[PDB]
């Protein structure tokens, strides 16, 4: 099996440990963070989201000990001196958000990795694969990045609606979930000003270059699609509004027919569809990427759609960064 | 002055009343609803989302008080028997939402008064005014309805998007606040399924002619112009997406200069702009129906943008339904 | 098994169906409300709270299929022309909130059922319930009541605290979630006017017999305790605060001790134990009625002490309805 | 009048310098914090609790000009730095939560400045004021601190029932809305492992010594009082539940009556009362520390009693920060 290290115990980093659970080819043999055992233990059973975790865990000797497997848990605040060789890591899931260039994610191989997968958008001119969109371009690299969680509920959809009819141009909307980086109240944003405004009270402009980002797993796309997000008051869940110009002619029919056919065929168990009436929480748990809503979407004409894709931000995302580890690990 | 009865105590039918208060040129003399005096006294004492009334009000024998004027109260399940003309009710606002249609509506003259205002899209032939759009084109009917909150806000920006640039085609989406038609936690709702779902813990996608409502406030438009909604847990306040297709090339700068032009010019008052991290309460209270957010939009290219605009979907509209009474009253 | 016909497919109606798939003793054969099938499938299918459904679920001719199994859907404004004798129920599951009085309830009896199990406090002088507290003393009547769902929580742990130290007196505050009868912005509640406040927006204080009520199942406490209840911003899972004066003094961990021994005991499965730094969302799905949380509570002195316990007011009560259902039909 | 000094300008800092606005015995000259003042301005033009700044506000030349008299920004971290004497600052507002202790708040008087006001509850041996409570115990001390919001709305309370009727002993609990130091998302809080829960989605345990404190302004009731608290998701104001055994037999009459005179003599200001069907947003911007809710109480018999006062956690205390400045330069 695939030895795998994870470096941040945020959101992604424990809900990738618990995708991870039910996988056979990958196993998560360390974790680190600036939290103890005894802490993690707690952060891994219970789940405010995804409810309590299905297994068992507990601390042996300031070691976390999950359904029967021993854990090694460290508190290196530099990648460096993480030693992964030690405990046999092969990749590292460097979920942390702090080094998502080269150099910063090289110290992870420097400390005895062979590969790093990066759980956000690289900075920097790494490599980023979007199951569904590139994973077949991966080359070997050492040092790789899954993109965003936007950007994978994105792409799957339009490469297929590109594939089939041709995309003009795009632009897009996502009506995003609160997440960590947000705050309870009105407080310090630096950085982004509205970002600081309490979440649970506003829908919040953010900016994002997920729809941009597109363009880079999918050469064809590059500088057809822009766009932008609010975030809302819901804890889970996305959902993205593409509204697409078309160069072949399509009925709404057709649309919901080619992306029925790629969900049931070449990209199944990445892009889904449904033609129920379903909510964001329908999809709390989701592993595909992008769940294309049939009902939901809305043409003016037979050349410019709106089309609507759900996500779990949390859950999709997380499954892919798994994927892409074992793909690149192949 | 204008005299005034209020047929709905709802979210409305309560705002308008309170905005009312303000005016010099009308008076409310009446409410007609389904509630005592007392407990009528206490929804406009108290408002979750506004506030405490900024006045006095109290009940005297059976009657409402409000700043010292005395207020009608009945309970009439049909508006026929009304006797608005007892009271010399000149205009009535229609805010049950129930009577959308000139045979029910008429009820209300038939009952004393001299002309009505449904304060929702009409649902059959009665005309639909949205200032900044075609009050000038009102004919003198004595039945006229205001349209709906997100009409109120779409159009005024289109019809300065259009009148400069040339609106080939448009597509909109209304991120809207939680209303008084959805439910607390999954509950029965026959004709909206999605709009049953508990309010609070999703993003509910849901249906709206309001853009093409926008094609009879503004002829030019018709057809042009379509959309949907996305219903969040916000309490109040909601916000426009619009991504169209333009005949003149236009940069992002010169639109924002055209939209601010209306705004301090002809539509003064009725469409606002801002340049401001502005965040959804920040409108609370907004009187404006269309408020353009600068920093917000985003242009794919000269032809192609998505804009961005503001509305407090219970005050901005209240505002505009007293507009709309005083100009079918000169 | 035990043949039960459910009356009302609301919260609880719906969640006493999923609770029943599990069961071995209870088979659902009809479900009477007006709803069609097929929306009856959707409310099933898909839950904002609970997830989806784990099982299969179709309408096969107006008739819905859950699991393979036929279930007869209805749509009897009066429980008398319910037939449950052609479907062979045997117990039905009176859960619309209508019929909580001996004779509306009876209809169901008069209509072919054996026997009623009202899933609320009743309104007369039937019968009421509560595992862990009375259930031995059903004497054999054909129409009984499971109480409240605040009740089925306080009275488990009220007899565990009197039997070991004798309560003198209790004042107890419900911190509630919020429910289907309230509304999502400030609304018409003629009977309750707090209550008809935006349910996301405040903490609404609440009337509540449910401490007064626990001295019907557990006599020896008659008119020892009291309280209320404050609503807040959750979709589910409450909590209770007893404050108690106690006869024989008591050392929090003798009291800890106490409530634990009960759990692994007499009330396992009732009465839940814990002193983990649990939230409410770590007992949605929860099946005790009771949840006592050790590291919550706070004692002044070994005669004065503040105990808190949790309880999933859909879950846990809809496990007990079918609790009793199993108990009075042996 | 009264120059003041800010240090802190989080949810505490801004408000008391709107309130403060209104004062004509005090003026904030300076502001320091690490936000530029084009940062801080828009904090203080935009609150999404209390809405937009009644008045102007701007940034002349790196100085921040409010209502058109200058404020001094800075942004040292270290207080001994600030030379309040330079912009002539009599007392400076503590509210960073940083500087709890006499040597550490001693700092701002070696910069310069007279007095110190904690607006939090001080961790040394620092007195501790309640207005209603102790203001005229103040000693002339140079340094002092406000307490704790619940102990600002708890005290003034008890003393009123103490006084009339003698607390043997009480225990309370704070329904407490949500706050800066909590989570959007489940995330790290070591300290405080509830307290890293996800804010919108849970009712969160909480430690509290409020009650415990009321025994430090109000010595007669020294080891009488304790309690604890629940978070929940709601932006501002919050409830205490007071939960008290009485010497001398008192009616619920009897107890609102000693509280309404209160209210209207020696605590006018501080202590409020209602008898209407209030929820927790009627008191959002509410000046009294603590307003007594008649209806919402309840009592068992005459000597053991739940009693319940509302409390704008954000601007009750501010205004009282204030009081204490003015009263101490007095």
């Known amino acids: 099996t695939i030895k795998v290290g994870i470096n941040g115990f945020g959101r992604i980093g424990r809900i990738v440990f618990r995708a991870a659970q039910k996988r056979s080819d990958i196993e998560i043999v360390a974790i680190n963070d600036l939290l103890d055992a005894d802490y993690m233990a707690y952060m891994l059973k219970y789940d405010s989201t995804h409810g309590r975790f299905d297994g068992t865990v507990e601390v042996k000797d300031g070691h976390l000990i999950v359904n029967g497997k021993k854990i090694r848990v460290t508190a290196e605040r530099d990648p460096a001196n993480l030693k992964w060789d030690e405990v046999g890591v092969d990749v590292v899931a460097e979920a942390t958000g702090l080094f998502l260039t080269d150099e910063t994610a090289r110290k992870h191989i420097t400390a005895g990795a062979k590969k790093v997968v990066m759980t956000g958008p690289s900075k920097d001119n790494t490599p980023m694969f979007v199951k569904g969109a590139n994973f077949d371009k991966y080359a070997g690299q050492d040092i790789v990045s899954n993109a965003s969680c936007t950007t994978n509920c994105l792409a799957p959809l339009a490469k297929v609606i590109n594939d089939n009819f041709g995309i003009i141009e795009g632009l897009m909307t996502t009506v995003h979930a609160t997440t960590a980086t947000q705050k309870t109240v009105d407080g310090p944003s630096h950085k982004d000003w509205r970002g600081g405004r309490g979440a649970s009270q506003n829908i919040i ?82 592993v595909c990427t992008s769940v294309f809503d049939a009902k939901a979407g809305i043409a003016l004409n037979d050349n410019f759609v709106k089309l609507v894709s759900w996500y779990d931000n949390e859950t999709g995302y997380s499954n892919k960064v798994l994927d892409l580890i074992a793909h690149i690990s192949k």
Do not use: C, H, W
């Open 205 to 286: 402009p953010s900016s994002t270059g997920a729809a941009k980002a597109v363009g880079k797993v999918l050469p064809e796309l590059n500088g057809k699609l822009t766009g932008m997000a609010f975030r809302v008051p819901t804890p889970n869940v996305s959902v993205v509004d593409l509204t697409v110009r078309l160069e072949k002619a399509a009925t709404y029919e057709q649309i919901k027919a080619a992306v029925k056919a790629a969900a049931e065929g070449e990209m199944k168990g990445v892009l889904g569809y449904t033609e129920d009436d379903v909510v964001s929480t329908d999809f709390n748990g989701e």
